[PDB]
Design a protein around this nucleic acid. Structure first.
Length: 431
DNA sequence: CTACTGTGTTTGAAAATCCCG
DNA sequence: CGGGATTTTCAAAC
RNA sequence: GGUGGGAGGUCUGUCCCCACCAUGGGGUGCGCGCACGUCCAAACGACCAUAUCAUCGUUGCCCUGCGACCGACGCAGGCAUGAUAUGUAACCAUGCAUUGGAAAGUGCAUGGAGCAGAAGAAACACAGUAG
């Protein structure tokens, strides 16, 4: 009963939790920043139609940026020459197929800017990288020899990363996954038996709070015949005798089953709505940004800064020492702002994290019991017409639940399509 | 005015070049 | 001075 | 004993640890006490400490005196209410320097980190919404 049956994974991403050293964390942050500068400068230059970064002209004169050319060593060399602070990102994170230009920029231009020529396209529509949307990720390639799990502990890895010395300790090593021809090996067994891909992708990210993670993408190479290039398995639990289940959605519950069991969404927002709201108004009048009193203050300071620099540069001819230049800065938020900013970030990550874990648990207990899902809709726009659930949807996210159910019904290969729930299941059986 | 959410898209392999014991 | 680690190329374009 | 939280990848409880409030009052039993069970009260992203800022009667009072009207106005003072900044919170062990003749911390470098029950697909992009 409830046997841990192995499943063949099409892909994976071992989301773990790195514990870097202070200096190593600083280096990783510098790497994020260098990627940000690369993205900003390259896409700042693509709009001046620069053929050194843009592709070739057309029969009608149209030009798009070419991304096979941004993965050449020549433009990367030009970027390193322009500023050195960009030299710190790994070339595998910029030039390879999962890099800063062949993965981010490709989707960014192909969807955000609707795939239209770079001379007919605007600059205010493109969203650059800044504090609102920073670059908190990089995808480099390492061999399995840099993934050496801790011998004593069944949850501690030891990950070595490029340009990085120290072999990160990555807690949370998912040891529910087994490698080999039939998934009967540990990690060391497959590493020694040479059953692991020589170049595996890792994505170090830094979340809203200062917290560095990793996502190792165990992934089969090709689909030649019925045999993937590499194979690895995960063990999951299923009810001993599954039966068809028509899931139902209510007002005060997160999910209702046709059998009778119901899971209650404990409203993680409203219970902490008071503290979230008080912290929100708290930051609203602190020393930092998002204050409307010092945002305008620093915008002003920047305004007279550029005004005075213009007045001293050209009219003053900038000979040697004209007048007495004062530069100041855009000012920094004070720590008492940072402490409550981080506290609110921690609280809201904890709230969404409780939501995610609750949905994980509920989906796990509903996935095994159901051999055929009968959900109504995969989308939110097909249930907002009546607006009855909008009040519940304000604090409860149906999309996370729907996506989790959708992909977890695929691991068991379960096809996806109380009285009302039973009627829904009967209709699903009919069609 | 920041901060969170619904929806779509991805997810290497092998040489060639460089360099601290 | 040399195996291994870092970099580059694989490869087209609304 | 309850409330909020910090590390052990995530959730609950516990383990360790930090800041707080009840030692109360009430529906009914039995022998001044026992509550078999629920009820209300507190304490909510800290805590103090430091100096510097509310404003429309504000933050209300003390009304410490002062001036003037016929219960009400203004002037010079304080209280803790709130909010702006800084020294400042959350497991254990080792190694280096310092605080101390010690005890115990400080700053740095590491190392390790459950137990009980559940689960563990992440990154990017682009809209829109909440506050």
């Amino acid at each position: 009963s409830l046997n841990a049956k192995k499943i063949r994974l099409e892909n994976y991403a071992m989301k773990m939790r790195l514990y870097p050293s202070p200096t190593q964390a600083e280096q990783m942050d510098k790497m994020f920043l260098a990627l940000r500068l690369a993205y900003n400068m390259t896409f700042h230059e693509v709009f001046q139609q620069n053929p050194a970064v843009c592709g070739d002209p057309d029969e009608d004169g149209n030009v798009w940026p070419s991304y096979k050319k941004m993965a050449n060593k020549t433009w990367r060399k030009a970027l390193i020459d322009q500023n050195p602070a960009i030299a710190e990102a790994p070339a595998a994170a910029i030039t390879t197929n999962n890099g800063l230009f062949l993965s981010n920029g490709q989707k960014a231009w192909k969807t955000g800017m609707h795939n239209l020529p770079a001379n007919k396209a605007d600059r205010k529509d493109f969203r650059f990288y800044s504090l609102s949307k920073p670059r908190r990720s990089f995808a480099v390639q390492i061999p399995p020899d840099c993934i050496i799990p801790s011998d004593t502990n069944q949850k501690v890895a030891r990950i070595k990363l490029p340009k990085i010395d120290g072999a990160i300790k990555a807690r949370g090593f998912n040891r529910k996954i087994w490698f080999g021809p039939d998934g009967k090996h540990t990690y060391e067994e497959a590493l020694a038996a040479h059953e692991l891909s020589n170049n595996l992708t890792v994505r170090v990210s830094k979340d809203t709070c200062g917290d560095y993670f990793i996502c190792i993408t165990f992934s089969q190479g090709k689909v030649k015949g019925d045999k993937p290039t590499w194979e690895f398995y995960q063990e999951v639990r299923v009810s001993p005798i599954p039966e068809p289940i028509g899931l139902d959605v209510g007002i005060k519950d997160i999910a209702i089953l046709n059998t009778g069991t119901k899971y209650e969404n404990k409203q993680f927002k409203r219970d902490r709505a008071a503290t979230l709201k008080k912290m929100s108004r708290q930051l609203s009048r602190r020393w930092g940004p998002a204050n409307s009193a010092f945002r305008d203050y620093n915008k002003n300071i920047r305004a007279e800064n550029r005004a005075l620099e213009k007045a001293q540069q050209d009219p003053g001819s900038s000979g040697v020492g004209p007048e007495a230049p004062v530069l100041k800065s855009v000012a920094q938020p004070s720590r008492r702002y940072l402490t409550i900013q981080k506290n609110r970030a921690k609280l809201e990550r904890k709230i969404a994290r409780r939501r995610d874990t609750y949905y994980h648990q509920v989906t796990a207990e509903v996935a095994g019991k159901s051999s055929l899902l009968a959900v109504e809709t995969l989308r939110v726009k097909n249930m907002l017409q009546n607006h009855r659930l909008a009040f519940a949807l304000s604090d409860a996210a149906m999309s996370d639940f729907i996506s989790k159910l959708k992909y977890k019904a695929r691991r068991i290969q379960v096809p996806l399509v109380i009285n009302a729930a039973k009627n829904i299941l009967a209709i699903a059986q009919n069609m």
